[PDB]
Coordinates of C-alpha atoms and ligand atoms in Angstrom, one line a residue:
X22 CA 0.0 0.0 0.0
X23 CA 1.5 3.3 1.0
X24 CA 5.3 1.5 2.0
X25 CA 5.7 0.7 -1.3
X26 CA 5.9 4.5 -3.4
X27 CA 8.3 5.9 -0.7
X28 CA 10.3 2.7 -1.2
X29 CA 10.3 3.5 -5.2
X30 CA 10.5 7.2 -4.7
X31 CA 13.8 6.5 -2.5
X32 CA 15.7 4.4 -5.1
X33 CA 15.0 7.3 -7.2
X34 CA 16.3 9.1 -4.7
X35 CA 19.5 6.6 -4.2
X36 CA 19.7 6.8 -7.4
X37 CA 20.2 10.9 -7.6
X38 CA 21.8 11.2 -4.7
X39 CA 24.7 8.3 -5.7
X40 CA 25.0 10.7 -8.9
X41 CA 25.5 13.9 -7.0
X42 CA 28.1 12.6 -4.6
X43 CA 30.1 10.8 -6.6
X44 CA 30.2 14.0 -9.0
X45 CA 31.4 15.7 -6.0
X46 CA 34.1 13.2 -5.7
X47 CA 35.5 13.7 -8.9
X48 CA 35.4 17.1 -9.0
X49 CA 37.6 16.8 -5.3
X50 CA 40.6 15.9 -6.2
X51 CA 41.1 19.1 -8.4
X52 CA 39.5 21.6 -6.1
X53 CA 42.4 20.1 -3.9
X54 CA 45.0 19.5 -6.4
X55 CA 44.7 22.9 -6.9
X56 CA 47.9 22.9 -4.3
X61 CA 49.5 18.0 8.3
X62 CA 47.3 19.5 5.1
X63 CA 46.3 16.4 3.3
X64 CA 46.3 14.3 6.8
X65 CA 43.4 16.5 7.6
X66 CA 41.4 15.7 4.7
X67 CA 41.5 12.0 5.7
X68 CA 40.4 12.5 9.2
X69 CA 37.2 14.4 7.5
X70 CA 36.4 10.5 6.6
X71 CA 37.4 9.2 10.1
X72 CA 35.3 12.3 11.9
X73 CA 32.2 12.4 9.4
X74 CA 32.3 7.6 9.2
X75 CA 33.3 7.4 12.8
X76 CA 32.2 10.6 15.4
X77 CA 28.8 11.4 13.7
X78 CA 27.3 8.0 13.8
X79 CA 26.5 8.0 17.2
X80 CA 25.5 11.3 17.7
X81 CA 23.7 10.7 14.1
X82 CA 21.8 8.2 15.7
X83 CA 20.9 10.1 18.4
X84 CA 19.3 12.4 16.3
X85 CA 17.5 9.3 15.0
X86 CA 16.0 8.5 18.1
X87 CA 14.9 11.4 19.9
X88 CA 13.6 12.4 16.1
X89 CA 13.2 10.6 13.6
X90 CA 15.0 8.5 10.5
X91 CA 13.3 11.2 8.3
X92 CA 14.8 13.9 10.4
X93 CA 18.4 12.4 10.1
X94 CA 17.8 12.2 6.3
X95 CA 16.7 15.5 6.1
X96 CA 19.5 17.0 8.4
X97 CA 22.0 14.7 7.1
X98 CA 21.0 16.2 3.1
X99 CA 21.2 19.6 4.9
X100 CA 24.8 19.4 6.3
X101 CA 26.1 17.7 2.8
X102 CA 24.7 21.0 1.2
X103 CA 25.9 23.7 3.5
X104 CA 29.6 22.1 3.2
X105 CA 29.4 22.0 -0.3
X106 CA 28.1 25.3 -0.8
X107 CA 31.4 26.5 1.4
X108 CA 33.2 25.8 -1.4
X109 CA 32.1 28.8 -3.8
X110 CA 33.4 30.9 -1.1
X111 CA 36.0 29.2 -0.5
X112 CA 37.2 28.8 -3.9
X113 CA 37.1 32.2 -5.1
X114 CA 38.9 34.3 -2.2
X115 CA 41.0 30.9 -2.0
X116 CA 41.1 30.2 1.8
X117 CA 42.0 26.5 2.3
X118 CA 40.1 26.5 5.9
X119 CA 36.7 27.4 4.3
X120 CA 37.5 24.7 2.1
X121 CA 38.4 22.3 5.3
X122 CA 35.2 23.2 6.6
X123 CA 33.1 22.8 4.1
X124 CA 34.9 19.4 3.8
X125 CA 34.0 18.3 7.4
X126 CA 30.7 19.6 7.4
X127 CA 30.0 17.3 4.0
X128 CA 31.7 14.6 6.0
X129 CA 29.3 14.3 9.0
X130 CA 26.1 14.7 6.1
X131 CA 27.3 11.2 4.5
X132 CA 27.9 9.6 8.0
X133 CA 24.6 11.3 8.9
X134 CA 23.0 9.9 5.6
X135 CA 24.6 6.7 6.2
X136 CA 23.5 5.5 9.3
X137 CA 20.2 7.2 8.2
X138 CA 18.8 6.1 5.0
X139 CA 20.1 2.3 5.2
X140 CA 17.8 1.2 8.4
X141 CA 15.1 3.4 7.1
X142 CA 14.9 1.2 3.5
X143 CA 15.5 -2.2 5.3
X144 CA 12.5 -0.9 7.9
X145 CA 10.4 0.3 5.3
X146 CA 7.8 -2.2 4.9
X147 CA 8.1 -5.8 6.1
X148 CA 11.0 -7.2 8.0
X149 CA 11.0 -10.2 5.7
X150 CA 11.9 -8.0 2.3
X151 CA 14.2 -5.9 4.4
X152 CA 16.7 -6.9 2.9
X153 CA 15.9 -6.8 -0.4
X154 CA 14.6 -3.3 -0.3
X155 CA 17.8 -1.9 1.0
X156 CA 19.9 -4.2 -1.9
X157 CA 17.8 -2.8 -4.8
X158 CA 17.9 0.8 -3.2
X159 CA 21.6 0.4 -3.7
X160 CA 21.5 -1.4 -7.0
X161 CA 19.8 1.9 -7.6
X162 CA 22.8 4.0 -6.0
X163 CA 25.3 1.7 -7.6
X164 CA 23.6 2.5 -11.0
X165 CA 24.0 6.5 -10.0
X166 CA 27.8 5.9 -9.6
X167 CA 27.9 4.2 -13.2
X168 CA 25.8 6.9 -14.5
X169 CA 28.0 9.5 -12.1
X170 CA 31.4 8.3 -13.8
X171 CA 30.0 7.4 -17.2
X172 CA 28.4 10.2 -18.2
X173 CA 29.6 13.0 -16.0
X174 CA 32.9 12.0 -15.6
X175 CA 33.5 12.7 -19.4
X176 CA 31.4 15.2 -19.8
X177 CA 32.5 17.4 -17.0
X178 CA 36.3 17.1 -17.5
X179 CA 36.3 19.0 -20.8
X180 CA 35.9 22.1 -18.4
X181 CA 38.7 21.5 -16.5
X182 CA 42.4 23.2 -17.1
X183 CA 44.8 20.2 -18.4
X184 CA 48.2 21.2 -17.2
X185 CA 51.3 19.3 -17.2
X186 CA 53.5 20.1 -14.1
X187 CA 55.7 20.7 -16.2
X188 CA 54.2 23.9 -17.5
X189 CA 52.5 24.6 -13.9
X190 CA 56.0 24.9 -12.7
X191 CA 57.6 26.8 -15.1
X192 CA 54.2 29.6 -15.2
X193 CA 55.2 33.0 -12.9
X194 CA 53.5 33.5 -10.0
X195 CA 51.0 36.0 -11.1
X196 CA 50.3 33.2 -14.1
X197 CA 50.0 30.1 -11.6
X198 CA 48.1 32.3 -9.2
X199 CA 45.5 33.0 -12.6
X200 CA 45.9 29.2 -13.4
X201 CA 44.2 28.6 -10.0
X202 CA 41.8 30.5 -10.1
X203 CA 40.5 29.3 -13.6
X204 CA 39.6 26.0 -11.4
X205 CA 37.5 26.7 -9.4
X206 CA 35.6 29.1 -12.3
X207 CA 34.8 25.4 -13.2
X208 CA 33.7 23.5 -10.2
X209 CA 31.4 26.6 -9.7
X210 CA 28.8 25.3 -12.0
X211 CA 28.3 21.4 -11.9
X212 CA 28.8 22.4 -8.2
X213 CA 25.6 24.6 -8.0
X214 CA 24.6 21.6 -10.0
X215 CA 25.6 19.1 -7.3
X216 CA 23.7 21.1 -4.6
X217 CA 20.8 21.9 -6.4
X218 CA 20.0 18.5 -6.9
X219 CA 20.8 17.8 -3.1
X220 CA 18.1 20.2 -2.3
X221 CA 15.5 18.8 -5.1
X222 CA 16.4 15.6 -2.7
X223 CA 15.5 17.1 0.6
X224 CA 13.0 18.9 -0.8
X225 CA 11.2 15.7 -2.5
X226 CA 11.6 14.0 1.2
X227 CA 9.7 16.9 3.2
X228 CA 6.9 16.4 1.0
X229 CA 6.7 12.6 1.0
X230 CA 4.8 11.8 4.1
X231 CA 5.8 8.0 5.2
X232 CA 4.3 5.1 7.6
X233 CA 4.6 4.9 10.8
X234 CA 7.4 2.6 12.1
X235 CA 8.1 1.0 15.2
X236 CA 12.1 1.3 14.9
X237 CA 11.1 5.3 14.9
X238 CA 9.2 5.9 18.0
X239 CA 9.7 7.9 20.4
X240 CA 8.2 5.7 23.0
X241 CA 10.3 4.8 26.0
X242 CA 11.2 6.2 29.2
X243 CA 14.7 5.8 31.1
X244 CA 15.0 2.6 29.3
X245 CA 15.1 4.1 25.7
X246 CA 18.8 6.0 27.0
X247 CA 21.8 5.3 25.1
X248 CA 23.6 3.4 27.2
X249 CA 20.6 1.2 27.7
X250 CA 20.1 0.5 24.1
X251 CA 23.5 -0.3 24.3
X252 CA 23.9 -2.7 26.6
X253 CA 20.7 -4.2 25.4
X254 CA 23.2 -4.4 21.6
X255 CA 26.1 -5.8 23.3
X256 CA 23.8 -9.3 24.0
X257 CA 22.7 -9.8 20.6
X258 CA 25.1 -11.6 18.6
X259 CA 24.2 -11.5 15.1
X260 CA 24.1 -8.0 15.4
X261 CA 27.6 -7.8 17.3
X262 CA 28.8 -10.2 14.4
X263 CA 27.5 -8.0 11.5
X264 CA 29.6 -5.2 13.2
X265 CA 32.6 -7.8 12.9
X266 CA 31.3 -8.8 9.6
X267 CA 31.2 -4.8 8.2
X268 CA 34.7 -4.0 9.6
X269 CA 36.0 -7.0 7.8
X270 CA 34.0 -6.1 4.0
X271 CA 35.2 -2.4 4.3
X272 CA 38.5 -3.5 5.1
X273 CA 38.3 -6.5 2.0
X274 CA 36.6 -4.0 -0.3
X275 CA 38.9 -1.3 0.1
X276 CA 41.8 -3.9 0.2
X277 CA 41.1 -4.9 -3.0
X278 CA 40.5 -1.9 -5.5
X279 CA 43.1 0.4 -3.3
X280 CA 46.2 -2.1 -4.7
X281 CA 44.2 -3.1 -7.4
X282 CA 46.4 -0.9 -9.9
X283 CA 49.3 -1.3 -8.0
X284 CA 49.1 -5.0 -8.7
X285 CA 48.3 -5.0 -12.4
X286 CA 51.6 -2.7 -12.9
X287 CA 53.6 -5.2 -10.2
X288 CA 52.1 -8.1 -12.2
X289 CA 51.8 -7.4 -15.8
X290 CA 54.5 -6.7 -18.1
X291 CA 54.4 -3.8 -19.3
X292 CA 51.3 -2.6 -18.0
X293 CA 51.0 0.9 -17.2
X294 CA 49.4 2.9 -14.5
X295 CA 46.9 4.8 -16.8
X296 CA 46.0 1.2 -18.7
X297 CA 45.4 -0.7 -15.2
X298 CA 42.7 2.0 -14.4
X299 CA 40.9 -0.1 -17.4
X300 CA 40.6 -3.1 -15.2
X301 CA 39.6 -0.5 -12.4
X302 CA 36.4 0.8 -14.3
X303 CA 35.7 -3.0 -15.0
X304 CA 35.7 -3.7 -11.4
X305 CA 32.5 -1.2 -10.9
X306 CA 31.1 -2.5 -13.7
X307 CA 31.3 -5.9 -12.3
X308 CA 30.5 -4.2 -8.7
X309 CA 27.0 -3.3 -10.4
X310 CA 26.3 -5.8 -12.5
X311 CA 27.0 -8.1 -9.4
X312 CA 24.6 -6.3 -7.1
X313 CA 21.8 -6.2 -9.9
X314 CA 21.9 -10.2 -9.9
X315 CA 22.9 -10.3 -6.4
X316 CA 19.2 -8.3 -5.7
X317 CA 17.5 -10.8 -8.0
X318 CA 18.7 -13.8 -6.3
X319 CA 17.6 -12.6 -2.9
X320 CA 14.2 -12.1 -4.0
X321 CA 14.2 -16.2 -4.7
X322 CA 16.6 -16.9 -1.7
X323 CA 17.8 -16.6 1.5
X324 CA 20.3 -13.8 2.1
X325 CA 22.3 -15.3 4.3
X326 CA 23.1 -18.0 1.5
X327 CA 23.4 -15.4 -1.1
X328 CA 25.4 -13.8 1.5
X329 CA 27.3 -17.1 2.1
X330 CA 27.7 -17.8 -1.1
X331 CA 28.8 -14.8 -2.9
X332 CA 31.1 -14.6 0.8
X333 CA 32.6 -17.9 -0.6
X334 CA 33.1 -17.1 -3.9
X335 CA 35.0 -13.6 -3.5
X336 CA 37.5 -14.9 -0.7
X337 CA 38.0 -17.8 -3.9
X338 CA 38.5 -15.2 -6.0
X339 CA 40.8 -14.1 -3.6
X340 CA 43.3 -16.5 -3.1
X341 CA 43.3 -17.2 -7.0
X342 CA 44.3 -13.4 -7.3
X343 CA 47.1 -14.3 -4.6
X344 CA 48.4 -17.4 -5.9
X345 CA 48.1 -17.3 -9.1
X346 CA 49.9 -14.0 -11.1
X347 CA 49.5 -12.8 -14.6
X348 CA 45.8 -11.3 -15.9
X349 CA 44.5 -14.7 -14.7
X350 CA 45.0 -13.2 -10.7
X351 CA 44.3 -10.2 -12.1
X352 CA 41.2 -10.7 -13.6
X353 CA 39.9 -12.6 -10.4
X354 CA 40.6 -9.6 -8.4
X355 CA 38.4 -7.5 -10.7
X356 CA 35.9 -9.9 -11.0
X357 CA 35.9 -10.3 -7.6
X358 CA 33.5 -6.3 -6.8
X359 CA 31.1 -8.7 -8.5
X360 CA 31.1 -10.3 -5.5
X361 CA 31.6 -8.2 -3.3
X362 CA 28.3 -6.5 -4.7
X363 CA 25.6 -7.5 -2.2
X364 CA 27.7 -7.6 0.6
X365 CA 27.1 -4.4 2.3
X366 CA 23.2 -4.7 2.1
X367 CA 23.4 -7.6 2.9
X368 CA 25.3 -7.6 5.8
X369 CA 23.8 -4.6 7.5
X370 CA 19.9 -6.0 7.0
X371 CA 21.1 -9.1 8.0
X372 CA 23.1 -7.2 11.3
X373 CA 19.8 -5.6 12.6
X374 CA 16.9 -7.3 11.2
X375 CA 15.4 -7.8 13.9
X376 CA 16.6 -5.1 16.5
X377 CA 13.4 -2.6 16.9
X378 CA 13.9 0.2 19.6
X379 CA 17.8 -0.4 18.8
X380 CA 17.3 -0.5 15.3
X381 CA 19.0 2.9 15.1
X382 CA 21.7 3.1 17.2
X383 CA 22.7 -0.4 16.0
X384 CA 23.5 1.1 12.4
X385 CA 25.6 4.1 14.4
X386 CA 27.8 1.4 15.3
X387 CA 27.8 -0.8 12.0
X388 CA 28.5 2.9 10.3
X389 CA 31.7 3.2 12.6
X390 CA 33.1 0.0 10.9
X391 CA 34.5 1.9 7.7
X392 CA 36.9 3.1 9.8
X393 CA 38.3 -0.6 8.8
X394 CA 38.6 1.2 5.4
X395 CA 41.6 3.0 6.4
X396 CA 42.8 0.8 8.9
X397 CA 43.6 -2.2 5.7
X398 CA 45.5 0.0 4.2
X399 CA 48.8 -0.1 6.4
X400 CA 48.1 -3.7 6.7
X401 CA 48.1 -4.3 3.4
X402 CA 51.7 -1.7 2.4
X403 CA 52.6 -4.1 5.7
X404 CA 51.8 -7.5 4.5
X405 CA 52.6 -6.3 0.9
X406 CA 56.2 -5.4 2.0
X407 CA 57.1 -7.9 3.9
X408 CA 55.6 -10.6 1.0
X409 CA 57.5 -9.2 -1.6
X410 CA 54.5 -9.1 -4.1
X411 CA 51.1 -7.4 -3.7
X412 CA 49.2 -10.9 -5.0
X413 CA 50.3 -12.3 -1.4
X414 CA 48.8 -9.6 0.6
X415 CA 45.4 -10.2 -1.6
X416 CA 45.7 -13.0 1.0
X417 CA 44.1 -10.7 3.6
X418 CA 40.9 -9.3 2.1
X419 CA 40.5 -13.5 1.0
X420 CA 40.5 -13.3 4.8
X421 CA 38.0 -10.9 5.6
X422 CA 35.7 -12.8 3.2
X423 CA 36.1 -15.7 4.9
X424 CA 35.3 -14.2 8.4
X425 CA 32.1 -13.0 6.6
X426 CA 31.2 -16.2 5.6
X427 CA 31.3 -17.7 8.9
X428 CA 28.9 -14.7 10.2
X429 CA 26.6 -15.9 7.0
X430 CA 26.7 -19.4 8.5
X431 CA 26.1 -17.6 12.1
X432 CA 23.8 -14.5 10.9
X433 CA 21.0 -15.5 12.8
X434 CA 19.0 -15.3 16.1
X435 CA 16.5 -16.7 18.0
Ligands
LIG1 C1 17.3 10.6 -0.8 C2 18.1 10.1 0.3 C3 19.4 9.5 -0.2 C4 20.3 9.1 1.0 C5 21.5 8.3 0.4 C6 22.4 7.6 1.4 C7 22.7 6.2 0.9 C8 24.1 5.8 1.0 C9 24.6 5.1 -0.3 O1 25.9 5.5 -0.5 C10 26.1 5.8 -1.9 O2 25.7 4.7 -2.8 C11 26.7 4.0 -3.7 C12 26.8 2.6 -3.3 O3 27.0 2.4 -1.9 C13 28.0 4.7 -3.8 O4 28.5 4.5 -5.2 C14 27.9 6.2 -3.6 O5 29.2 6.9 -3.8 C15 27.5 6.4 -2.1 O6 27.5 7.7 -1.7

């Protein structure tokens, strides 16, 4: 009945949304390589994945999901819009602001709009709500790359270094400024369409949902809820689970590159990126199958299964070499694809009350993103080779198999 067109009118709104961000992450790097600085940026992630979660979820709970949403759209909005300021008169901190303030929208968003989809409507198709909302996403991102990426790019001031050094001051300092003429367009773009968003989700009056209310006394505090979390397993194990995918995912197309140059000769960095874009298009194509295969089955077995498979593809990529490891890695996002859904429905389907700050936590988990990443320079270093280190998202995969085979409660 009426849990049905908010559910359609939010993939939409996946959709759009996964388009606008990831338009905002390609114009990034530019706006920044425009020039303890970068180290800053990076902690952006950590603050907006790992601080705002909880307090996110606080929101939640003493509002509503909706309310999180809506805030969460608004702070994405109001840091991006620091930019146009920030850009023209060229102060970095406005910029750095801006940055952080987008940061805590997407955690906001994040812990948000995932629990909202899986909640919206039956807890049976929970899961496969939130999988198609991403499909829906992950076709924004193709979309966001494909067309954008291309056309977008044709705006933006090609400069070798080489000339960027030589240029005088009062010519670099013009070069500059020539930038950010050009993200200040697709960037009114980007948060106009985040506002259509908010806007579209203020209007759109939703069910009523027990995960939202209000309703509790001394017993709905934090630290209730959370001790209340800390006895359910599955959901601990999802948070295990989620630290481990993040980790895995990352893991994989971070040193993706680096292992098709290490492992191909001659491959070169600019070619590799080939196998890079494959690897999304796998991701996608993955999750659009993925989604169909959980309407006929189990998620936990589709979970399990696609768990399997990826850590398989895994240790090929490690033992093996050539394009045949190679090509396993890439084909392994295909895998990967349902995984995130999939795990976080599974991780609080069926939490009520605790629903929401139960994803705060899960959220917190892409910290593992970063955390990998020394790991894997570690691992790789000590191995020699990068196909070895593959060895440890094959290991994450595994971990999140045995959660698929110990997903459950009751
Ligand atoms: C109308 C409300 C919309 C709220 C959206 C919050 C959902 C979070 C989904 O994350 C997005 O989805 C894709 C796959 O995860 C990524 O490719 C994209 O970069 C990422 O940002």
């Amino acid at each position: 009945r009426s849990y049905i067109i908010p559910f359609a009118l939010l993939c939409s709104l996946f959709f759009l949304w996964a388009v606008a961000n990831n338009l905002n992450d390609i114009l990034l790097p530019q706006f920044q390589q425009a020039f303890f600085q970068a180290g800053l940026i990076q902690s952006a992630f950590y603050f907006g994945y790992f601080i705002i979660p909880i307090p996110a979820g606080i929101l939640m709970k003493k509002l509503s999901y909706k309310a999180g949403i809506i805030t969460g759209l608004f702070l994405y909005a109001l840091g991006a819009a620091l930019f146009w300021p920030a850009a023209e008169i060229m102060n970095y901190t406005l910029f750095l602001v801006g940055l952080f303030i987008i940061a805590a929208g997407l955690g906001c968003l994040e812990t948000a709009a995932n629990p909202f989809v899986t909640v919206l409507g039956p807890e049976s198709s929970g899961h496969f709500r939130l999988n198609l909302a991403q499909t829906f996403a992950s076709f924004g991102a193709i979309i966001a790359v494909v067309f954008g990426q291309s056309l977008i790019l044709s705006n933006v001031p090609h400069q070798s270094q080489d000339v960027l050094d030589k240029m005088s001051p009062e010519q670099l300092s013009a070069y500059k400024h020539s930038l950010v003429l050009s993200v200040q367009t697709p960037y009114m773009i980007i948060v106009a369409i985040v506002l259509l968003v908010a806007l579209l989700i203020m209007l759109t009056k939703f069910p009523a949902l027990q995960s939202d209310n209000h309703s509790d006394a001394k017993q709905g505090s934090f630290s209730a809820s959370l001790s209340r979390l800390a006895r359910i397993r599955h959901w601990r194990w999802a948070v295990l689970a989620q630290f481990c995918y993040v980790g895995a995912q990352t893991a994989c197309w971070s040193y993706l590159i680096r292992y098709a140059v290490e492992e191909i000769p001659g491959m070169t960095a600019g070619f590799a990126a080939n196998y890079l874009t494959g690897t999304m298009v796998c991701f996608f194509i993955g999750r659009f199958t993925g989604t169909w295969l959980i309407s006929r089955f189990a998620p936990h077995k589709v979970l399990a299964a696609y768990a399997l498979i990826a850590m398989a593809l895994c240790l090929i990529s490690a033992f093996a070499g050539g394009h045949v490891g190679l090509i396993a890695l890439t084909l392994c996002s295909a895998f990967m694809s349902i995984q995130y859904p999939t795990i976080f429905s599974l991780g609080i389907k069926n939490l009520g009350q605790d629903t929401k700050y139960g994803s705060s936590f899960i959220v917190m988990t892409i910290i593992g993103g970063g955390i990998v990443t020394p790991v894997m320079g570690f691992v790789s270093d000590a191995a020699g080779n990068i196909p070895t280190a593959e060895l440890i998202p094959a290991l994450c995969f595994a971990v999140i198999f045995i959660f698929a085979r110990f997903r459950s409660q009751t």
